[PDB]
């Protein structure tokens, strides 16, 4: 039963790996929200600079 045992233990290890992928996958997906916010703050900063220049250009 040593080969059987090694095979059965292999299964437990493969399940463990499946859970690691799921864990990695879950965090990658949730971190997507953080990236969404990063992109949004930058796009917002971009428009503000553009709006600010419109103003300065008018004051000139």
């Amino acid at each position: 039963h040593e080969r059987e045992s090694s095979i059965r233990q292999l299964e437990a290890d493969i399940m463990d790996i499946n859970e690691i992928f799921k864990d990695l996958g879950m965090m990658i997906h949730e971190q997507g929200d953080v990236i969404d916010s990063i992109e949004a703050n930058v796009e917002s900063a971009e428009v503000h600079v553009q709006q600010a220049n419109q103003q300065l250009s008018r004051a000139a």
Binding site: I14, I17, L24, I38, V42, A45, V49, L56
Partner: protein, 55 residues
Amino acid sequence: DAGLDALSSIISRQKQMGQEIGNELDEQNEIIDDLANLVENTDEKLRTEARRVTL
């Protein structure tokens, strides 16, 4: 026997994927660090211009 062959092939893909992911994550952390630096510098230019405006 044969079942191990099909399983071995499957696990084989896993390893390469694991390596691709690692390379991707490493590069992304570089990109993020690059961005932090760019944000910091742009934020400083912003501060400087806002000040000039008030002057």
